[PDB]
UniProtKB/Swiss-Prot annotation:
Protein name: Egl nine homolog 1
Full-sequence range covered: 182 to 414 of 426
Organism: Homo sapiens (Human)
GO biological process: cardiac muscle tissue morphogenesis; cellular response to hypoxia; heart trabecula formation; intracellular iron ion homeostasis; intracellular oxygen homeostasis; labyrinthine layer development; negative regulation of hypoxia-inducible factor-1alpha signaling pathway; positive regulation of transcription by RNA polymerase II
Gene: EGLN1
Modification S-nitrosocysteine occurs at: 18, 25, 117, 138, 141
Function: Cellular oxygen sensor that catalyzes, under normoxic conditions, the post-translational formation of 4-hydroxyproline in hypoxia-inducible factor (HIF) alpha proteins. Hydroxylates a specific proline found in each of the oxygen-dependent degradation (ODD) domains (N-terminal, NODD, and C-terminal, CODD) of HIF1A. Also hydroxylates HIF2A. Has a preference for the CODD site for both HIF1A and HIF1B. Hydroxylated HIFs are then targeted for proteasomal degradation via the von Hippel-Lindau ubiquitination complex.
Source superkingdom: Eukaryota
Amino acid sequence: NGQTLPALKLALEYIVPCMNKHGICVVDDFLGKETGQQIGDEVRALHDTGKFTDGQLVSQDSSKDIRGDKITWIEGKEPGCETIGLLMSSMDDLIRHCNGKLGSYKINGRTKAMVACYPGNGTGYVRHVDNPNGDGRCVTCIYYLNKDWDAKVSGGILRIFPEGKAQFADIEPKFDRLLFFWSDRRNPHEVQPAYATRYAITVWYFDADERARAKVKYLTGRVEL
Ligand SMILES: O=C(O)CCC(=O)Nc1cc2ccccc2cn1
Ligand SMILES: [Mn+2]
């Protein structure tokens, strides 16, 4: 839970040592209240104008279906997503300044942003691993936007189950909080049921080597003969 600061200072004095020791790192006050609020306004606008999906099918008469986390993929260049793009550029700055110091990984790319909205209907996200099968993602980066979140009332804690340790790491989805954690089986995790609207923005960073050999395993095409 570091206190945010120049991307370099954050990276060098906190993110790198913490990731190498624990594999889970939390930075509070990452962008500040004004920018964080602008991001919140953008995400809420996406929600209000219908850009999210209807939500993960949780319970399947279709009228009674229960849906959970809603998502939209954001590049950061869309009209009205400018400050999300600024967040993504800031995440990228941090990771660049971590180059070669995050384990033995060499990060050379990332996904688009996955913006998630838990609608507050008691749904969460079941325990899972982000990259269980070697798809190239080495670091999960999540930015939370929920002002005055109170988990005692609203739920929505991200619980991580660090491998080989008999303990939970419970992360409240607090406003302006940035979370990094290794994407692989070291960090299974779940979202506890959320009883208020809960937003988060996720990017995953690729390790060059794992991603290069995933491409071979994945095999999307192909050159014609
Ligand atoms: O919001 C948070 O605290 C993170 C919750 C979480 O793990 N979300 C998540 C959402 C995903 C959506 C599509 C594919 C993989 C996914 C992996 N993880
Ligand atoms: Mn996940």
